[PDB]
């Protein structure tokens, strides 16, 4: 549940929780090229690749 992303300079920001990531995503700060991962993930992935592979990003909330 520990999210990281790379900023435009390549610096790794985080960890952030699901709610913080979801808020920033809904506010529009993230393009689908933003590179994200949790500590437990294999590699950074752009949000768009996560969407193409899973149909959703894990931090998106819902029922």
């Amino acid at each position: 549940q520990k999210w990281y992303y790379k900023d435009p300079q390549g610096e790794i920001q985080g960890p952030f929780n699901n709610q913080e990531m979801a808020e920033w995503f809904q506010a529009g700060y993230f393009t689908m090229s933003l590179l994200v991962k949790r500590a437990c993930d294999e590699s950074f992935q752009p949000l768009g690749d996560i969407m193409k592979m899973w149909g959703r990003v894990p931090f998106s909330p819902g029922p």
């Binding site: 992303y5 900023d7 435009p8 300079q9 610096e11 920001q13 952030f16 808020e23 920033w24 506010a27 700060y29 993230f30």
Partner: peptide, 9 residues
């Protein structure tokens, strides 16, 4: 609400 560290909006 703060912006994401390393991003500005």
């Amino acid at each position: 609400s703060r912006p994401p560290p390393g991003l500005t909006g």
